[PDB]
Design a protein around this ligand. Sequence first.
Ligand code: CA
Lengths: 5, 284
Amino acid sequence: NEYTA
Amino acid sequence: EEARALGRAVRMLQRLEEQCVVSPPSLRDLLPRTAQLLREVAHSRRAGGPGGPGGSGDFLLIYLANLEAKSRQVAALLSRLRRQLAKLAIIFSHMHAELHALFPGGKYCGHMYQLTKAPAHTFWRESCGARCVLPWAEFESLLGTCHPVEPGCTALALRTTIDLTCSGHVSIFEFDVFTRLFQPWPTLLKNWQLLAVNHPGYMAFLTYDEVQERLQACRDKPGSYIFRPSCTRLGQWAIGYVSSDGSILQTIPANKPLSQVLLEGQKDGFYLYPDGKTHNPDLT
Ligand SMILES: [Ca+2]
């Protein structure tokens, strides 16, 4: 899954 | 008894895998991974750690009976269905992680396992000794030496938070995850009550895709945010939020108390409207 800063 | 149990669990997981013909957590991925780990356990048990209640054998008796009940639930199910299957995927994700934490490679390490937070580590080994698992009722009373919870709805909400595998028993791994999520230790239950009982932004047992979906309801309200435990980095939080342009993003923050992270994000104008609601609670 895409977790961003 | 134990080798029979392991054989039964592996067969149930093979049945499910065959009956299950997406993004994490995914049963299709987790079923064969768990069955492979169980096989590794079985080989290792036929050649152990400190004996008695709460040891390796006790852990497996409990774990395998729960894994059967959960596997029966999945079988019985193959919008409501989508939710029931996402909740069970999270539960299997947690069962798989707990067994990987305590029997990596099939080889028991619950008597050596070390918690992430030092004060919580000390509490577990001083209170529980070499044990890797306790029934809820005994855990509640042991935790109560340090951090007592009010019996009733509050204690039951705590149970639901801590018990990742929904097994009724607390392993040292679950306690590791709980004390990371709700650090710092000296105020553990006050942190938990403020964040997981009283805060509108807290969601329990949701996947990444379920928060993506839920926050679409607030996409015209930049600043809206929810937080829930990560399913792939257990012990860490995942914060979903609506950015200035209406896009739904999710971030895993720095290893620090969630309260500090939420306070900073409020002050910076990013986490303003918990679950899109008008009132942000004060966390000071
Ligand atoms: Ca459990």
